[PDB]
Scaffold this active site. Structure first.
Site, PDB file in Angstrom:
ATOM      1  N   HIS A   1       0.804  -1.050  -0.004  1.00 27.39           N
ATOM      2  CA  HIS A   1       0.004   0.134   0.133  1.00 27.39           C
ATOM      3  C   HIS A   1       0.788   1.298   0.144  1.00 27.39           C
ATOM      4  CE1 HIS A   1       1.050  -0.652   4.230  1.00 27.39           C
ATOM      5  NE2 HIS A   1       1.068   0.541   4.149  1.00 27.39           N
TER       6      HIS A   1
ATOM      7  N   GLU B   1       6.013   8.986   5.327  1.00 24.64           N
ATOM      8  CA  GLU B   1       6.020   8.727   6.809  1.00 24.64           C
ATOM      9  C   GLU B   1       7.250   8.805   7.092  1.00 24.64           C
ATOM     10  OE1 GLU B   1       3.493   5.180   7.354  1.00 24.64           O
ATOM     11  OE2 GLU B   1       1.955   6.836   8.067  1.00 24.64           O
TER      12      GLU B   1
ATOM     13  N   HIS C   1       4.961   0.927   0.926  1.00 28.54           N
ATOM     14  CA  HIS C   1       5.373  -0.102   1.956  1.00 28.54           C
ATOM     15  C   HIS C   1       4.732  -1.321   1.355  1.00 28.54           C
ATOM     16  CE1 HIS C   1       4.747   3.123   5.475  1.00 28.54           C
ATOM     17  NE2 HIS C   1       5.903   3.141   4.633  1.00 28.54           N
TER      18      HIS C   1
ATOM     19  N   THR D   1       2.945   1.600  11.329  1.00 30.69           N
ATOM     20  CA  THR D   1       2.572   3.022  11.435  1.00 30.69           C
ATOM     21  C   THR D   1       1.011   3.238  11.460  1.00 30.69           C
ATOM     22  OG1 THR D   1       2.349   3.502   9.014  1.00 30.69           O
ATOM     23  CG2 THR D   1       4.535   3.505   9.918  1.00 30.69           C
TER      24      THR D   1
END
Ligand SMILES: NS(=O)(=O)/N=C1\NCc2ccccc2N1
Ligand SMILES: [Zn+2]
Length: 257
Positions: A91, A103, A116, A195
């Site tokens: 994703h 991020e 990711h 995360t």
């Protein structure tokens, strides 16, 4: 429930998920001058030749491309890792504007988005058992900058119109994730967490130094997705990133000099 808005976003998560204030939370800022080259680190082995994609899903937080993880079809090995980690999904996180969205940050620089690729350690048998272990997961993170189009991303972009809203999914077989990688596998690595809630501290992070370039039109199509379900008021799926968290008692290692 949790999300990315002012009333349910990252500053609120700790009330339901107290590990949000834990000792190995992600993402982090990667201070490139403090990160140390580790000659004991091995080259990353990314073995995606037999990857078997299944489906793409809008889960109300991002979109996930899911894979068949019942056999060693697409795996990550080497680098900081012991053993074998199977790819289960990938994703992205992205911004409302090109100057934000990643991020992880690099010397405080934010990229337009971050990919990711999530993998689980086969010695634990299934993803659910792996997320009960300190070495259960490995996430390969790849920065996206805006420039020339990424051809291997276009098939993802062209299906997003069919998964606009939360809970929608579409067939997404025969997708080759090798088309999302940069040329170099140079990386930074550190121990961290998911995360998103539940923020579990199970992840060996492997963050590639080289970004991939994607076009403005590609990332714009990400920004047309919706956080909401069909028939509900429209809320654009943008700024679905957690900011950098305290590094605490950790060291980031580099695979390269
Ligand atoms: N952005 S992240 O670190 O990959 N977070 C993730 N990945 C995979 C996953 C699976 C189930 C529940 C939450 C999460 N959270
Ligand atoms: Zn993620």
């Amino acid at each position: 429930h949790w999300g990315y808005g002012k009333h349910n976003g990252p500053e609120h998560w700790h009330k339901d998920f107290p590990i949000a204030k834990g000792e190995r939370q992600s993402p982090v800022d990667i201070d490139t001058h403090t990160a140390k080259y580790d000659p004991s680190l091995k080259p990353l082995s990314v073995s995606y030749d037999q990857a078997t994609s299944l489906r793409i899903l809008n889960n109300g937080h991002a979109f996930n491309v899911e894979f068949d993880d019942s056999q060693d079809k697409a795996v990550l090995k080497g680098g900081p890792l012991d053993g074998t980690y199977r790819l289960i999904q990938f994703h992205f996180h992205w911004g409302s504007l090109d100057g934000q969205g990643s991020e992880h940050t690099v010397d405080k620089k934010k990229y337009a988005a971050e990919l990711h690729l999530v993998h689980w350690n086969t010695k634990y048998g299934d993803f659910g058992k792996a997320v009960q272990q300190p070495d259960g997961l490995a996430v390969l993170g790849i920065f996206l900058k805006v420039g020339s189009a990424k051809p291997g991303l276009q098939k993802v972009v062209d299906v997003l119109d069919s998964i606009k809203t939360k809970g929608k999914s579409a067939d997404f077989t025969n997708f080759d994730p090798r088309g999302l990688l940069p040329e170099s596998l140079d990386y930074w690595t550190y121990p961290g967490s998911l995360t998103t809630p539940p923020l579990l501290e199970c992840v060996t992070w492997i963050v590639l130094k080289e970004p991939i370039s994607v076009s403005s039109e590609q990332v714009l199509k990400f920004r047309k997705l919706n956080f909401n379900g069909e028939g509900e008021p429209e809320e654009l799926m943008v700024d679905n990133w957690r900011p950098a968290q305290p590094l605490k008692n950790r060291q980031i290692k580099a695979s390269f000099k």
